[PDB]
């Protein structure tokens, strides 16, 4: 048909209390574009996570993360919306004092069906589901060769100003290769939104409650990345000018509450830039 296109940059931040030091902030760059002919979009996206910047480079384990997907959108349509994605993505890890490690590439590979069903003309029950197979240097990466998520649910919708969505998140991760143990997982969550959409402006408060979780890592004592969930109440914000600009702004508590003498605290913070053409 007509091809669409999007280009952006988003930076994010992710921080821990308190004061301190626990240590100390990460910082989260990324560029993406795509493309926009049919039921058939491409998208590239390059992604980054380190220590927050000060780079000397006096760093600390940080990767970077290549990603290209291709979606196929079967059938759209007002009752029963359809759609597919694979996806591959690789991390390429680059450890900076971390004994026994230098670097890594592992691979992810994606199959993400979607959908969007009536249920009447005030709720829709859509969602997507998301298996992944994660491929080479597991045991130096920590990550479980396979992993399901999905996040689905229900949306109300009060008016063109007013919806209200909440929904179930899953993210179970495990091993099909006996005998692997390394990255099993299992998080449970409820999340809730109320996206408001006033003309240009669109705000969305939200929260995700953990239903159960359950790891094999990162408590006492292991390093940081997916996945990796926390109770948190947010907002994002977001402005499209008509343009084909749109920028956002979203930042978000995350708390879990413990037995120790307290209960660990994070901050996150969003900027994003599109453009569409
Ligand atoms: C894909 C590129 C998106 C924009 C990159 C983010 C621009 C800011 O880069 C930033 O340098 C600054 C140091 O004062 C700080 O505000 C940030 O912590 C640092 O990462
Ligand atoms: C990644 C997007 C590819 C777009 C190709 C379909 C046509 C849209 O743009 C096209 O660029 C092509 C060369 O790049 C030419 O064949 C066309 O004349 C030009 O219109
Ligand atoms: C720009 C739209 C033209 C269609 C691009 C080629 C695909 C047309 O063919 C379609 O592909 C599907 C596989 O994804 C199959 O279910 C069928 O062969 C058909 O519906
Ligand atoms: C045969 C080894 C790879 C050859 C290059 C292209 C074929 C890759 O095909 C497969 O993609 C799957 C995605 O579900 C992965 O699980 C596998 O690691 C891979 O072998
Ligand atoms: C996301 C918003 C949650 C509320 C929507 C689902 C509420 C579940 O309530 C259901 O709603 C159906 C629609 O009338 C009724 O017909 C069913 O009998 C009832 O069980
Ligand atoms: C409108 C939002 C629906 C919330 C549904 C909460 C209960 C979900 O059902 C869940 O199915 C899981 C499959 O992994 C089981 O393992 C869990 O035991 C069960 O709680
Ligand atoms: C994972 C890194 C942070 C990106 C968060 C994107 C915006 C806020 O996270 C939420 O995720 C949902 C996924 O189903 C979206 O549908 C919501 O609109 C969005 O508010
Ligand atoms: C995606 C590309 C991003 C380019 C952004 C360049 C504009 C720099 O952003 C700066 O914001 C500040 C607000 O604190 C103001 O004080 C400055 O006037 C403004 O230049
Ligand atoms: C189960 C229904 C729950 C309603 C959904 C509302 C979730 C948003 C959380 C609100 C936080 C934003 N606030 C109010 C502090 O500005
Ligand atoms: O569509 C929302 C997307 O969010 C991402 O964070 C997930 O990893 C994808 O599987 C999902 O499709």
Redesign the pocket.
């Given at each position: 048909n007509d091809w669409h296109f999007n280009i952006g940059a988003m930076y994010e931040i992710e921080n821990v209390e308190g004061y301190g030091e626990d240590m100390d902030g990460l910082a989260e760059p990324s560029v993406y574009f795509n493309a926009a002919n049919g039921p058939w979009r491409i998208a590239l996206a390059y992604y980054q996570e380190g220590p927050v910047d000060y780079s000397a480079g006096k760093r600390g384990t940080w990767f970077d993360r290549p990603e290209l997907e291709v979606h196929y959108q079967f059938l759209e349509n007002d009752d029963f919306s359809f759609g597919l994605t694979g996806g591959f993505r690789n991390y390429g890890y680059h450890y900076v004092d971390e004994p026994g490690k230098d670097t890594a590439n592992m691979?992810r590979?994606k199959?993400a069906p979607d959908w969007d069903v009536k249920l009447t003309d005030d709720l829709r029950f859509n969602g997507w589901l998301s298996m992944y197979?994660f491929?080479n240097d597991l045991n130096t990466t920590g990550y479980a060769d396979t992993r399901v998520e999905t996040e689905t649910g229900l949306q109300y919708t009060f008016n063109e100003t007013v919806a209200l969505r909440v929904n179930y998140y899953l993210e179970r991760g495990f091993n099909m290769d006996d005998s692997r143990n390394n990255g099993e997982f299992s998080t449970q969550e409820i999340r809730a939104y109320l996206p408001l959409t006033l003309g240009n402006h669109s705000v969305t408060p939200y929260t995700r409650i953990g239903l159960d979780r359950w790891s094999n890592w990162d408590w006492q004592d292991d390093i940081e990345r997916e996945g990796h969930d926390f109770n948190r109440v947010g907002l994002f914000y977001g402005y499209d000018f008509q343009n084909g600009l749109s920028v956002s702004l979203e930042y978000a508590f995350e708390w879990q509450d413990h037995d120790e003498g307290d209960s660990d605290k994070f901050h996150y913070a969003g900027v994003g830039v599109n453009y569409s053409f």
């Open positions: 691979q590979w199959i197979k491929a």
